[PDB]
Amino acid sequence: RTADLERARLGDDGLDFQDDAAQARAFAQGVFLLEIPEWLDLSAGDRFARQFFQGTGVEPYGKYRDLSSEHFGDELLGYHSRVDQLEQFLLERRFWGEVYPSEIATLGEHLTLLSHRVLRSVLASAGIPEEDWHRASGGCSETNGSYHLTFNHYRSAHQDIGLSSHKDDGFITVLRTTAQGLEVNRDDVWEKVPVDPACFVVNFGLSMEILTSACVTPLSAIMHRVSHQNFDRSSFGHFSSSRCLDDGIYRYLPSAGLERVCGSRELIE
């Protein structure tokens, strides 16, 4: 009912789990906890997630409610009401400096570099040659990927599930949640992700699963969901996926290199 997750920290040689066994369990479960660097201020992000949906009467972030999909050439960005309790504000990195408040873009840039370090520690453990990392990761092994900083609010007045079962797109998700609600289908039972506001929740997406399907330890994009909320809940996440402006989505074939599977666009769909 409550999942037991391995905990890691970012140190000098990438991810430091307690030992090599723990790291292998974590990567194999597809979800683990990552301690939040003590210098990293998350308070502006927390407030944005509590406010973005409220409209221009609420300062300083309520006005972002009015930036809907039409203000962007990209269908998927801005404020969106979902079918579940969730509503969201989503923005890819190319737009952070112009659109987000400056302190929110800063948070996004910190998360991007933190996510980059986590991703490289994961690629090394998969036995992929370093010179293939950039193309395998669609740029995320450097700072060339696509990055979404996404803010979530669950409308407890809506009778739906919070957010229905899904696997993330992309390579790596760093999730900041401070309230009960997240659930993962680790083995075959649904389990609650325990609350720990001093850690992020890290999991992988479909592009990571595709990439590593033929490795020694294939990595899985874990199915997860948010249960029906009786009171409001908010959260936010940093999502890394392939740059899509490159082209392809790849699978690594040991001893041979990268095989193109599909495109950036058709995978999101």
Q: Binds 226, which of ligand AKG, Fe ion, none (CB < 5 to 8 A, cut-off by type)? A: ligand AKG
Written as one letter, the residue type at 164 is S
Comparison of 105 and 182: residue with beta carbon closer to ligand AKG: 182
Told to check if 90 binds ligand AKG by CB under 6 A, we report no
Comparison of 6 and 87: residue with beta carbon closer to ligand AKG: 87
Told to check if 168 binds Fe ion by CB under 5 A, we report yes
Long-range pairs of 56-63 with CB within 8 A, sequence gap ≥ 24: 60/101, 61/101
By CB under 6 A, name the one of 46, 168, 183, 191 that touches ligand AKG: 168
Q: Binds 148, which of Fe ion, ligand AKG, none (CB < 5 to 8 A, cut-off by type)? A: none
Q: Binds 115, which of ligand AKG, Fe ion, none (CB < 5 to 8 A, cut-off by type)? A: none
Told to check if 226 binds ligand AKG by CB under 6 A, we report yes
Which one of the spans 69-77, 103-111, 161-169, 260-268 is the region binding Fe ion (CB under 5 A)?
161-169
Residue least distant from ligand AKG (Cβ):
235
Shortest distance (Å) from residue 224 CB to ligand AKG = 6
Structural contact between residues 258 and 250, judged by C-beta atoms closer than 8 angstroms:
yes
Comparison of 128 and 208: residue with beta carbon closer to Fe ion: 208
Beta bridge mates, 10: 15
Structural contact between residues 264 and 246, judged by C-beta atoms closer than 8 angstroms:
yes
Q: Which of residues 142-161 bind ligand AKG (CB under 6 A)?
A: 150, 152
Told to check if 141 binds ligand AKG by CB under 6 A, we report no
| Rounded Cα gap, residues 25 and 1, in angstroms | 18
Question: H or E stretch including 149?
Answer: strand 146-154
Collect all residues with Cβ–Cβ distance below 8 Å to 239 and sequence separation of at least 6. 147, 148, 149, 150, 168, 169, 170, 172, 173, 205
Count of residues engaged in binding ligand AKG, rule: CB under 6 A: 11
Please state whether 126 falls in left (phi above 0), alpha (psi between -120 and 50) or beta.
Answer: alpha
By CB under 6 A, name the one of 112, 115, 229, 235 that touches ligand AKG: 235
Structural contact between residues 241 and 221, judged by C-beta atoms closer than 8 angstroms:
no
Q: Binds 182, which of Fe ion, ligand AKG, none (CB < 5 to 8 A, cut-off by type)? A: ligand AKG
Q: Identify which of 175, 156, 176 has the alpha carbon closest to the alpha carbon of residue 233.
A: 156
Structural contact between residues 55 and 115, judged by C-beta atoms closer than 8 angstroms:
no
Comparison of 6 and 168: residue with beta carbon closer to Fe ion: 168
| Rounded Cα gap, residues 169 and 166, in angstroms | 9
Told to check if 177 binds ligand AKG by CB under 6 A, we report yes
Told to check if 207 binds ligand AKG by CB under 6 A, we report no
- Interface residues with ligand AKG (CB under 6 A)? 150, 152, 163, 168, 175, 177, 182, 224, 226, 235, 237
